[model samples]
Target: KKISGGSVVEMQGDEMTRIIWELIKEKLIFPYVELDLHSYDLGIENRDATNDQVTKDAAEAIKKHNVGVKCATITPDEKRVEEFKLKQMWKSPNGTIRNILGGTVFREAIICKNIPRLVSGWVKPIIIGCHRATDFVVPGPGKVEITYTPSDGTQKVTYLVHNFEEGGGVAMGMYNQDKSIEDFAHSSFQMALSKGWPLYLSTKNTILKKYDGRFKDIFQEIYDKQYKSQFEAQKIWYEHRLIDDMVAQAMKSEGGFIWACKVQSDSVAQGYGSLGMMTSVLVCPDGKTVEAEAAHGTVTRHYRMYQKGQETSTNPIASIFAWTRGLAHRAKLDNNKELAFFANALEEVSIETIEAGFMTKDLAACIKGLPNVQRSDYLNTFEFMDKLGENLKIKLAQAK
Candidate 1:
C-alpha cells in the first residue's frame, strides 16, 4: 500500500537557516519526491506588509494542509522593530501558530558520534515533549504572598504582601483545555507504544499542584484506562516524574526514552539550545502526523560570512529527520511495511552519515580539542545532504 501523500508549506525566514532551507529543498526534497508547495514569505518585510496577518494565514494553512516545513523567522523585538521599521513589535509567529493549532511541541536531539552533545552520555536520542500551555507561559497574574493574622486581642498585620521581582525570562500563558490535553495524551501514548520506549510524563506538581497535578492526573487516568494494557503487552511502562527529578534522570540515563517535560513558557523562551539540531513533529488526532523544520532563526553569523561568498558549514540532519520522522509515522499509519522500512532506513542513514564524519562546522567545532581533528574532517552542508540523499536512493533500491 502506498502512503498517502501530503502537501508541503514552506514558510521562509531569516539568515543562515534561510539559506540552509533552500539547500534542503533542492538537494534533499526535490530530487527525492515531488511536493505541492504552498509558499508563505514570513520574512520581516512580508510580516510588516501584512501587519503579521501572513503569520496567521500560514498557521491557518498548516492546519488545513496538515503539514508545513517552516524556516526560522525573527520574533520582532525592540532591535527588530528598529531593523524592520514595523508598526509595533509583534509576538513570535511560532507562538501564534501553536496557539491557533493548539498543539504541543516535542523536541528530540539528533545524535551523531562526531557531533558533541552537552550531555555526552546520550548515545540514543531522548525526545522531550514540553506541554506548551501551562507552568510558565500564562502564569496567572499574582504575587507569592504571606497572609498572617496577629494572635493579639485585635487582629494586626506584621508584613503586608507585596510583589517580588521576577528575573528576566520568557513568559507565555497557555491553556490546554480538556479536549486538547486528551489529544496530546493519545498522541504521546501512541508514540511511546510504537517506539517501544518507556514513556515519562514530568510535572512540577508539588508547587503548581492544581495546574500541574491536572497534567499528572490526566496522563495517569489515560494510561490506566487505555494505555496501561498496551504498554504492558509491549513490555514497556508509562510513568510520571517531578520536573526536577525528570531532568536529573534524563541527564543520567543513557538515551532511549521518551520524556514528557512539563515546561513553563518562561523556560522555553529563555533559549533552550538550538532547534537546529532538534527534531519536531506534530501529530493530529486523526493519527495523521506532519513533520517539518523545527528551528527558527538560522545561524546568522554563518549566513553573513556566506553572503561575502565565503564557504560555510551548517547541519541539515534535523531537517532530514523531519522528513524521516514524518514519513515513519505515515508508514505506520498506512501499515505499509516497505514505506515504514524506508523511513527507518533514512533515519539510520542520517545517523550513519553524521557518524561517517560528514557534518557542519558547528558540530566540527565540538571535535576541536580531539587529538586528531582536521579541517578536512566534515563535509560542507550541501555535500552532506547530497551524500544522505544518495544513500537514501541506494537503500530504497536495495530494499526494492
Candidate 2:
C-alpha cells in the first residue's frame, strides 16, 4: 500500500492526453496507491462554463493543500476556439497556477538507461523558473513601453522605446524581487535535499550579472544560512554554476549524473522528447505547495486520429511519473517511509519495463535518432501500459 494519508490536488485535463491519464490512474495509480485527492476539472468546456474560474480555484487549492497532480489541458487557439467554442481564448491553466503559487517550474527528462542515447545514463532536471514574463511569442514591429509607480504612491519611471511600430523594432522592461529569488532558491534546494542528491543552481552570472546573478546569490545565501548543514549531513551539496558551464557539464557528464539534481523533479522531462516523456509539477519556495503535470501541451493531433478507428501508440511515461511523483511527495508529507519506498519501487519498475524493450513507438523512435517502423518493434500505447503493469505485479509480488 502507498500514500494512505495525504492530500493531493488531482487536476484533470483534455483530449487524448486525458484518456491516457484515466488509464494510468485505473490500471496503475488506483491499484497501488491511496491518497486524499482533491479533484478539479480544467477541461476547456468546464473552464468556459466556470468562466475560466476553475483554473484559479485549482491554483488556490494547490496553495492551500500543498500538492497537486495535473493532466494536460486544452488552451484555445482559433481551431480550438471552433472546436471547444470557448467563450474566449482562455489563458493557460499552468500560467494561472504559477502566478498564484509564486515559484519556479523545473523541467527534466526521465531517463531509461537502456533507451538508446549517447549519454551513459539519465541526466537530471533543469530550472523551471519564471525567468521570462510569459511564454508568448510576440510578433515584432510593435511599440513597447513601461510605466512604474512606487508601492508607497511615489512616481518611479515611464518610457516608450525605439518607436518600434514605425521603426519596425522592439522595446522591453523587466522586474525582480528578493522574495521571489529566495523562493526560487528554496524550491531548488528542497528538491535536491529531497532526493539526497547534490544540486547546482545554474546562472549566466558573468553576462546577466544582476539578473541571473540574483539566482546564484540567493541560492548560495540560502545554502549557507538554511540548507547547507543538512545537505552536507546527507553528504549532498548545492553549488552555483554559470549557465554555459552547466550546459557544458550536462553535455559531457554520463552525463546524466553530472547533468542534474532533485526535489520534486516535475517541471520538465530529462530528454524533452515528447508529451509522453514529459511530466509537470509545480514546486513552491516553502517546499509545501506542489502541482505535478506533464510538460507537453494537449495532444489535439492524436485525439483527432483517436476520434477515428485508428490505433494510437501514445507513450504514457510522463503521466505515469505524475502518479509516482505525486505519491512520493504524499509519502514525504506523511513521513511514511514505507509508502515512499513503494512509490520509488514502482517508478524503478517502470524504467525497468521500458529498458527491457516493452516501450511504445515514440520511445522506440527516441532510441533511433531516426527510426524505422515495424509493428513488432513497439507496442500500442495501451498495450505498453499493460506490459508495465505485468512487470509491476511481478515486482510487487516479489517485494511482498
Candidate 3:
C-alpha cells in the first residue's frame, strides 16, 4: 500500500460503457491502487449542460497531466437529440479531443490464446497507422473552380467546373501539407524504433502522384535524415509499399510487423482478426502523453438487453486493457516500477482468465453462435469482470 499513486485525467462517458467504466475503476483500479484522479463527466448530458466545456476541460487536464484514460462518449444524432434532450448536437468527443491533443492514434491487438480469429494462422496484429492511409476528399459543392492565366491578366479566363447544371458534382479537395506529413513520418519512424518493427508507409503514389506523392517523399526524406541511421544501426529498415499490394501481402503473411497504413481498412482487418483482443492508444509525436481506449465501442445491443433486465455478455477485456496501458504509461512517467508491474499483472490475469475458458458473448459467438451456446460456455459481463478482479487479487497476492 502507498500514500499516493499517480493520477490521470479520467474522462467518464455515456451509456453502457459508463456503467462498465465505473465498475472497472471500482474493481480493477481503486481497490489496487490508492490514486488521485481528476475526473470529468464527458457523457452527452454533461457535454450539453456545460456547452461542452467539460470536454475542453478534460482535454486541458490531459494535456497538463500528460496521461488520459477515456471512456466512450455519445456522439448525438437527431434521434439521440430527442433521447438525451440535448441543447444542440455536438461534434464527436473523440474528434474534439484529437483536435486538442494533435496526436496520432494507433491500434494494436492484445492477442489471447482463447480468442480465435477466423484466419487460421493470423495471431499477431498489424499496427495500422500513418493518418489512415487513404485520403478521402469530403464530397461537397463549393468554390470548385481554379484557373491559371497569363501575365498582366491579358488572357482573362473563366471556367465553370463541378457544375451541377447538367449533373451535380462535388466541389471537394483532399490535401496533404508538408509539415503534417513530416509529423506523420517522424511518428512512424519513432514507432518503428520503439517497437523494433519495420515501419511501412503504404499510399498510392503511382496513380496519384501530386496527391499521394508528397507523403512518399516526406517519409523517405525524413527517414534518411532521422530514422535511417538508427534503423541501419539497429539493422532494421523502413520500406514503402502501395496500399493494394501491401494489404494483400500483410494479409497473406504471418503478422509480426509494425504496419503503417491508413487505419480504416487495417482496423477492420484488426477487428475481424482480433476484435476482443484489440486495444487502442493515442500517441503524439513527442511520445510522453497517451490516451488508451478499447477498439470496440459501447455495446449498444447488449446494453439494450441489460436495460430490459435480461442476461447480457458483452466483452470487457479490451476496456480492462485500456486502463492497464494508460496506467503503465503513468507508471513509466513516475518511475514507479511497482505500479507498472501491477498494471502488467492485471493485463496478464485478464487474458489468462479468458485463456482458461472463461470469456464473454463475443468470443462465444466467434466459437459458436447463440443457438448452440451453453450457459457455462461464457460468463455474463458482471461475472466476467468479477472473475478478472478475483484472479487479479490472487495474482497480486502471489506477487507479494
Candidate 4:
C-alpha cells in the first residue's frame, strides 16, 4: 500500500545525479508514496535556456510548499563553461537558491556500522550547521580602507583595514549583519531542540574580538533572550565555543551534537569517509521549511564513463537520503503518520541494505581496500538501487 498525503518541490539537476534521481523515484519513492510533486528542471542547459529563473521559481515553490528534494547540479566554472559551450557564466544555483530562501545549511553524515571510520569516536551523527570568504596579495605597498556611509545624511566614517609594507601580504575584509546572525542562531537552536542534542556555536572571538565576537555575542543574546528556557525544558542546551577547541573536542568526542560553525563538515565527511554518504539540508529560521539534497556534486567523472556505455558504480545512498529527509519533513508538516513511517522505513532500509553487504563501489572500497575489492564485492549503480527496492518491498510487507 502506498503512503498518501503531502507535496514536495522536486528540482532536477545535471549529469550522474540526475540519472540517479529518476532511478530513486522509480525504484524507491514512487512505489510507496503518493506525492503531489511540483517538478522544476534546474539542469544546466535548462537553467541557461531559462536564464536561471528556474532556480528562483524552485526556491519560491519550496517556500510555498515547505519541502524540497533536489538533485546535485553543476556550479559552472571556466572549464564547465567551455565544456557546455554558450551563454554567460552563471552563478551557482545553490548560492542563488540560498539567497532566496535565507536559511542555514546543515550537513550530516550517514553512518553504516560496517564501514570503517577514520574517527571511530563518531559512532553517532555529528550534525554541522550554518555555512564564508578571503583575497589578493599586495605586490609592494597598498592601503585598504573601509568606509561606512550613513543613510540619514550623517558624516561618513572610514577605517583603514590594512596597510601593506614593502613585503607583499594578503588582506581580506569580512562582515556580517546582526539580523542574519540572529536568524542563524534561531535555526541552530531549533535544529538542536528538534534533534534533542546540545548545540555549540564556534568562533575565534578571542582573536577577532569585534568581528567574530559579534557572532558570539549575537548567539548568546538570542539564546538568553529567547531559547534558553525552551532548551532547558527539553533538556538540551546551547553554548559558544572557541573554534580551535571546538575542532579538537569534535575530533575526540563521540558525536551527538550540532556544531553551528561551518568545513569541519568536510573534515567530518573525510573522517566518516566518502562524500557519497553525506546528506545536506537547508533549514529556515522557522524550522518548518527545508530543502534536502546529496552533499556531493554531479559526479561528472562517473557520468563521462557512463556516456561511453561503461559500467559505473556511483553510490546513490546520499541521493536516496535526500528524498527520505525531504519527505520526512513533509510528513511532519502534514502530520501524516503513515507517510512518516514510510520515510523512516526507507532510511532504515537504505542503511540496512548497506550493512547487509549490498552497496556501491565507493562504500565497498571503504570496507575492503580499493585495490582489493572485486566485482562481487559491490553492486553496480542500478543493481544496488534494485537491491534497495527489493529489500524495501520485503520490509514493508513484513510490517503489514
> Which structure among the candidates has the greatest lDDT?
4
lDDT tens string, model 1, 1-400?
3333346566887777777667766765566554566789888788888899999999888787666667777888898799778898988988887777765566777766666666777777776666644334324444544344656757754533344365333344445577877777877787677678899988889998877888888889999998899998989999899978888888898878887765342244224333456777665544454535654346677787888988777776676676666556545555657556766877787778768766666566566743455668767766777787787678767876
Cα RMSD (Å) between model 3 and the true structure?
A: 4.2
Local accuracy of candidate 4 as per-residue lDDT tens digits, 169-252: 777666687878888998898889878899999998888898888888888999999889998998888889998999898889
- The lDDT of each candidate is 0.70, 0.73, 0.78, 0.88
Q: Per-residue error at 320 for model 4, in Å? A: 0.7
Give candidate 3 misplaced runs (Cα > 4 Å). 2-4, 130-166, 233-235, 263-275
Q: Supply the global lDDT for candidate 2.
A: 0.73
User: Local error of candidate 3 at 43, Å?
Assistant: 1.1
* Cα misplacement distance, residue 361 of candidate 2 (Å): 0.6
Superposition error at 111 for model 3 (Å): 1.0
lDDT tens per residue, model 3, 257-296: 7776644644664455346566777877776778888776
Clashes of 4: 0
Angstrom error at residue 300, model 3: 2.2
Model 2 lDDT per residue over 218-335, tens place: 7778789998889889888776777677667766654322222212332323343444665666678788777777777666777888889688888778787877887788778879
Ten contiguous residues with the weakest lDDT in model 3: 132-141
Ranking 3 against 4 by lDDT, winner: 4
Compare candidates 2 and 3 on TM-score and give the better one. 3
